[PDB]
Amino acid sequence: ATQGVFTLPANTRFGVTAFANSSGTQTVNVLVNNETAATFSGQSTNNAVIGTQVLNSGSSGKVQVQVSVNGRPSDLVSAQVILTNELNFALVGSEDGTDNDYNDAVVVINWPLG
Amino acid sequence: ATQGVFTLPANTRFGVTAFANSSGTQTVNVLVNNETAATFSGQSTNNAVIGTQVLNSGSSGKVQVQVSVNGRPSDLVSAQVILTNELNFALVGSEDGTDNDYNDAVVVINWPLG
Amino acid sequence: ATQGVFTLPANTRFGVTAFANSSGTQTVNVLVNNETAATFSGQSTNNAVIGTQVLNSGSSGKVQVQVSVNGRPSDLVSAQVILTNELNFALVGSEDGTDNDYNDAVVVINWPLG
Amino acid sequence: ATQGVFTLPANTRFGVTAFANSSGTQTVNVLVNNETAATFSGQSTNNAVIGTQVLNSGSSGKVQVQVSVNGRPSDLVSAQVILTNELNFALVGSEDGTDNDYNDAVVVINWPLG
Ligand SMILES: C[C@@H]1O[C@H](O)[C@@H](O)[C@H](O)[C@@H]1O
Ligand SMILES: C[C@@H]1O[C@H](O)[C@@H](O)[C@H](O)[C@@H]1O
Ligand SMILES: C[C@@H]1O[C@H](O)[C@@H](O)[C@H](O)[C@@H]1O
Ligand SMILES: C[C@@H]1O[C@H](O)[C@@H](O)[C@H](O)[C@@H]1O
Ligand SMILES: [Ca+2]
Ligand SMILES: [Ca+2]
Ligand SMILES: [Ca+2]
Ligand SMILES: [Ca+2]
Ligand SMILES: [Ca+2]
Numbered sequence: 302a303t304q305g306v307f308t309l310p311a312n313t314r315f316g317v318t319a320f321a322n323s324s325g326t327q328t329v330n331v332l333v334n335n336e337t338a339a340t341f342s343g344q345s346t347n348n349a350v351i352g353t354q355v356l357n358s359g360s361s362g363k364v365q366v367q368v369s370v371n372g373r374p375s376d377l378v379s380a381q382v383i384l385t386n387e388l389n390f391a392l393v394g395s396e397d398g399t400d401n402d403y404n405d406a407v408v409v410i411n412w413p414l415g
Numbered sequence: 416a417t418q419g420v421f422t423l424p425a426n427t428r429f430g431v432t433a434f435a436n437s438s439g440t441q442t443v444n445v446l447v448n449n450e451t452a453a454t455f456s457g458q459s460t461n462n463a464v465i466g467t468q469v470l471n472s473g474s475s476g477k478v479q480v481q482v483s484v485n486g487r488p489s490d491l492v493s494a495q496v497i498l499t500n501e502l503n504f505a506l507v508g509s510e511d512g513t514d515n516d517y518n519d520a521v522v523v524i525n526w527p528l529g
Numbered sequence: 530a531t532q533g534v535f536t537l538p539a540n541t542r543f544g545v546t547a548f549a550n551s552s553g554t555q556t557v558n559v560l561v562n563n564e565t566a567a568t569f570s571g572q573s574t575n576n577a578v579i580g581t582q583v584l585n586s587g588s589s590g591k592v593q594v595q596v597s598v599n600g601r602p603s604d605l606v607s608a609q610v611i612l613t614n615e616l617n618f619a620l621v622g623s624e625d626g627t628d629n630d631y632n633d634a635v636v637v638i639n640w641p642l643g
Numbered sequence: 644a645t646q647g648v649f650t651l652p653a654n655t656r657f658g659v660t661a662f663a664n665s666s667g668t669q670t671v672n673v674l675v676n677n678e679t680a681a682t683f684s685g686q687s688t689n690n691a692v693i694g695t696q697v698l699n700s701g702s703s704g705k706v707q708v709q710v711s712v713n714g715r716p717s718d719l720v721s722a723q724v725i726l727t728n729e730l731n732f733a734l735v736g737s738e739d740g741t742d743n744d745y746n747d748a749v750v751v752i753n754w755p756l757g
C-alpha cells in the first residue's frame with residue numbers, strides 16, 4: 302500500500318521534523334500539492350534532528366514524504382493518529398537497508414500549530 | 416484515564432523530543448522509573464523543537480511525560496503507535512488553556528535508535 | 530480531555546462494534562448528531578460482541594460513544610488512526626472499576642465501508 | 644514493509660474479529676507462531692462480521708493475519724495502537740482490487756481480555 306502520503310486540511314500550517322538513525326546520509330523530501338516544498342539532509346546514528354520546518358499544506362492538503370539515501374529510495378511505513386479528535390500526528394519511518402529497524406529517517410508531521 | 420505514561424522494552428535507548436505552540440513558557444519533564452531524567456523548556460508559537468535527548472528506559476522501562484506552565488500542570492492526551500511491528504512512537508499532546516488545540520507542548524518519544 | 534467523540538466525513542456509512550470484558554453489564558450508547566442511534570447491553574469477560582451495526586454519520590458527521598454500567602458512566606480513552614491515508618479506525622476503551630485495564634467495554638468504529 | 648504481523652505478550656488471550664466489505668469472498672487466516680489458529684470465510688459489502696473468536700498468543704506471542712480472495716493474497720496495511728498504556732489494538736486492512744479502500748477484509752485484534 303501507498304505510504305508517506307497524508308491528506309491534511311487545506312491551506313493549513315503544519316510542522317515537519319526529521320530524525321536520523323543510520324550510517325547513510327538521509328534526504329527527506331516533503332511535497333505539497335505535488336511540488337517539492339522542503340528538503341532535509343543530514344546524518345546521525347543517534348536520533349539527531351536533521352531538519353524541522355513549518356509548511357503550508359496547499360490547496361489540496363496533500364502532503365507526501367519521500368526518503369532517499371544517495372539517490373536510492375527508502376521503503377516507507379506510515380500512519381496518522383488523532384488525539385481528542387483534534388491533535389494530529391502524521392508519522393513516517395523509513396528503511397535504507399536490510400536490518401528493517403525503519404528508523405533510518407523518522408519523520409514527524411504535526412498540526413495544528415500555534 | 417492516566418495519560419503520558421508508557422512502558423518501553425527494558426534497558427532500551429529512546430529519543431524524546433518536545434515542541435512548543437503557545438504564548439506560555441512550556442516545561443516538559445520526562446521521568447524514567449518515576450524519576451526525572453530530562454527536562455526541556457521554551458516559548459514558541461511556531462513549533463520550535465525546544466529540546467531533545469537520548470535516554471535509556473532502564474530495568475523498569477517505565478517512562479512518563481509531564482507538562483507544566485508556570486508551575487501549573489497541563490491536561491495531557493497520549494497514545495502509542497507501532498509501525499511494521501517494530502517502529503515505536505509514544506505521543507503526547509497538552510493543553511495549557513481552554514482553546515483546546517492540545518499542541519501547547521507536544522512530545523514525541525521514539526525507539527529503537529541507531 | 531474529551532474522549533469518545535469523533536468527527537467523521539458527513540453522510541458516510543460506518544461500522545460500530547462493541548466488545549465486553551468485565552463482571553459488570555456494559556451499556557454502550559452510540560450518538561450520531563447528538564441523538565442515540567444504537568445501544569448495546571451485555572456482559573462477558575471473554576470479549577463477546579455485544580453489538581455491531583452500520584450507521585450513517587449524517588449531516589454533522591459527529592459520532593460519540595458513551596459507556597455506562599448500571600447507570601454510572603465509565604471513564605473513556607480514545608483515539609483515531611488512519612492507515613494508508615484512507616482506512617479509518619476510531620477506538621474506544623472504558624473503565625468501570627479499579628484495575629484500569631480499560632477493556633470493560635471496547636468499541637471500534639471503522640470506515641469507509643462497502 | 645511487512646504488514647499484518649504483531650508481537651503480543653506471551654501466553655495471552657486475545658480477540659480477533661473480521662469484517663468484510665467486498666464483492667469477493669474473504670478468507671482470513673490467523674497464524675499463531677506460524678501455524679494456522681483460525682480461519683474466517685465470508686462475503687459482505689456491509690461490514691458484516693465474518694468471524695470473531697478468542698485465541699491464545701502462545702509462547703512466541705507471534706500473531707500474523709493473512710487475507711486472500713480466490714486464493715490470491717490481498718495487499719495488507721496494519722498498525723498497533725495502545726491507549727492509556729493498557730488497551731491494545733492490532734489493526735489490519737486489506738485490498739483485493741484496485742480501488743484501494745483497503746476495507747475488503749478488516750481485522751481487529753484486541754487485548755488484554757477479561
Ligand atoms: C548503522 C546502520 O546504518 C544503516 O544504514 C541502517 O540501515 C541500520 O539500521 C543502522 O542504522
Ligand atoms: C497563543 C495561544 O497560547 C496559549 O497559551 C495556547 O493555549 C493557545 O492554544 C495558543 O497557542
Ligand atoms: C472481572 C473484572 O470485572 C470488572 O467489572 C472490570 O473492571 C475488571 O477489569 C475485570 O474485568
Ligand atoms: C464492491 C467492491 O468489491 C471489490 O472486490 C472491492 O475491492 C471494492 O473495494 C468494493 O468493495
Ligand atoms: Ca535500517
Ligand atoms: Ca537505523
Ligand atoms: Ca492551547
Ligand atoms: Ca497552542
Ligand atoms: Ca476494568
Ligand SMILES: [Ca+2]
Pocket residue numbers: 550551630631632633756757
Ligand atoms: Ca476488564
Ligand SMILES: [Ca+2]
Pocket residue numbers: 665737738739740741742743744745746747
Ligand atoms: Ca477494495
Ligand SMILES: [Ca+2]
Pocket residue numbers: 642643664665744745746747
Ligand atoms: Ca471494499
